[PDB]
């Protein structure tokens, strides 16, 4: 049995080899304990405030909405230490690892952002961090790899298979199965086997909590909708969580549409995938007709996850949250628009969320609406990607 429900409706679960169940059970118990421990909450709050920079600003973007009846605010996770929301939960998980008496952290990464976040948290808290990364990725993300090593993390290139992250996702789990007594597996999103979807949500919940307090202070009411991009689902569930019980507040998740849903080259498993069982959970995923896990695609490496957190699939199923998709071109236009009109360079991941908000505004300019977009990260890292594409188009 478990202390908490591993499922969100039909989605979720703990689909891992038997050998890993003790690790998950230990983690769940430690988490439940931590959540009721005033001392743990205080330490976490202290790191978030004095090290990471919380609370993050809620910026009103007046230039972008000129001429319309849309009022747009951006929750500034791009101002968090590290440049992305990932920092919030890695700090929490690092504290959980220490609570369990562990001094080692195991992680894996694709775009490299989670690897960097894991490395910075481990350096701060004195944890020995080892990060598995696909050989192909280690080649395409040289900058992030150097950041990880600069911060003392051991970056382990794994050549097995199509050396994508799935080869390191497994490499990490294999390691963890035989070292979980002294090492904690720092999963990077609100997905995977229970208790991870729950832990990641709770350790990202402050995004929504702050947004609520800030919007009430600034507008005297809740948003008509909060919008967030969805790769694995952590920044979105972090923004959504505190608003779930506020039925008047729309929850909009934006999956990457890549070159277009009809092309098959996208990363929108929640709305265009098929429910399957992988990565320790039952959730919608990109898969072939006979069950092989398909490859996802997006201009933004950060949204290139082939599945999605179970709680999002559940919220969608009951109609509490709505999910849509935004193409590479729509994300790129949003990226350029925010740069020119607000002086903020958004992560291409976050640009997908902004792009949908821009669509909501532009499609119905006379519709009065108060919207909050979760600006999950900054886009300095995407400058070269955007540059190359623009030049290629003269």
């Amino acid at each position: 049995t478990t202390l908490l429900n591993p499922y969100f409706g039909e989605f979720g679960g703990m689909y891992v080899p038997q050998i890993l169940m003790p690790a998950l059970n230990q983690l769940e118990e430690a988490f439940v304990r931590a959540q009721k421990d005033p001392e743990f909450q205080a330490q976490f709050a202290d790191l978030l405030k004095n090290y990471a920079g919380r609370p993050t600003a809620l910026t009103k973007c007046q230039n972008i909405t000129a001429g319309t009846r849309t009022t747009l605010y951006l929750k500034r996770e791009d101002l968090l230490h590290g440049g992305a929301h990932k920092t919030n939960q890695v700090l929490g998980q690092a504290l959980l690892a220490k609570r369990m008496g562990k001094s080692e952290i195991i992680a894996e990464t694709g775009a490299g952002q989670h690897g960097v976040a894991s490395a910075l948290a481990s350096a701060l808290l004195g944890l020995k961090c080892r990060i598995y990364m696909g050989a192909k990725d280690v080649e395409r993300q040289s900058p992030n790899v150097f950041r990880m090593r600069l911060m003392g993390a051991e970056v382990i290139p794994v050549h097995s298979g199509s050396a994508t992250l799935k080869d390191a996702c497994n490499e990490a789990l294999r390691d963890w199965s035989g070292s979980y007594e002294t090492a904690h597996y720092m999963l990077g999103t609100a997905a995977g086997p229970h208790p991870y979807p729950t832990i990641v949500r709770e350790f990202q919940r402050m995004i929504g909590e702050e947004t609520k307090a800030q919007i009430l202070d600034k507008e005297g009411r809740l948003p008509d909708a909060v919008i967030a991009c969805v790769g694995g689902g952590s920044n979105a569930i972090g923004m959504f969580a505190d608003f779930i019980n506020d039925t008047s507040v729309g929850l909009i998740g934006v999956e990457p549409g890549g070159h277009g849903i009809e092309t098959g080259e996208h990363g929108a498993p929640l709305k265009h995938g098929r429910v399957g069982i992988y990565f320790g959970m039952k959730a919608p995923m990109m898969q072939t007709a006979d069950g092989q896990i398909e490859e996802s695609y997006s201009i933004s490496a950060g949204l290139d996850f082939p599945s999605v957190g179970p709680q999002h699939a559940y919220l969608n199923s009951i109609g509490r949250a709505d999910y849509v998709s935004i193409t590479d071109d729509e994300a790129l236009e949003a990226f350029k628009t925010l740069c020119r009109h607000e002086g903020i360079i958004p992560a291409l991941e976050s640009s997908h969320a902004l792009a949908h908000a821009l669509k909501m505004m532009r499609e119905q300019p006379e519709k009065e609406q108060l919207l909050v977009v979760n600006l999950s990260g900054r886009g300095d890292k995407d400058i070269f990607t955007v540059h190359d594409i623009l030049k290629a188009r003269g």
Binding site: M14, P17, N170, D290, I293
Partner: protein, 251 residues
Amino acid sequence: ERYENLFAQLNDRREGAFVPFVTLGDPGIEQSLKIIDTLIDAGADALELGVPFSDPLADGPTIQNANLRAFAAGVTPAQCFEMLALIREKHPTIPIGLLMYANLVFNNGIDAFYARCEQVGVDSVLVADVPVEESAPFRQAALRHNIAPIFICPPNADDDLLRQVASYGRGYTYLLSHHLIEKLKEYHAAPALQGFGISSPEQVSAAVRAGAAGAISGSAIVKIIEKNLASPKQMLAELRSFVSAMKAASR
């Protein structure tokens, strides 16, 4: 059924079972079928066969390579089932067990998967990433189609897990590489087969002495395949010698 008959027969002969594991379609459909017939002719008492999956978070390098080779040959689950039907048509009594990953079983419906297993003649299914805690739908569908649901019993398994494995499993209990063997018998669990790391004859004899009904060997088998890729004939020759040596240790 086939497992019960096998173990009953082995017991009457006071010997353990030797069960090799290989990936269906590795390095090709044709060569894989030949490899399997060689394993059987060499002395294999039962078989554990894997179906190539794209995202298998449980197999090591040797096996990971096997899947890559199979996929390079264009092997699909449908072709694997065609192979299984053929294998059963050639060998009517040898127990055949599959090593699966949950998505391939869940994909077109759990019930349909086990129904397909029953029609081709498969005897058991071990779903690598389905712990006893999530096993209900799988073991129920398995039993409805006369398929034995196999469960892994870790070495650190607590009493509750031992009882669950003993109650839910059929065919044989997959024991990861003693007193657990005694406790499993106490709970009337399916005969135990020790697996993981078994690559030498002495390990097979040790497993039987410890009280296990036999031993499973995979990586050692697959390694022989990948080292003789350029020499199909020598590959079969090597496999025959290895299997015969391992089987001899069980007598």
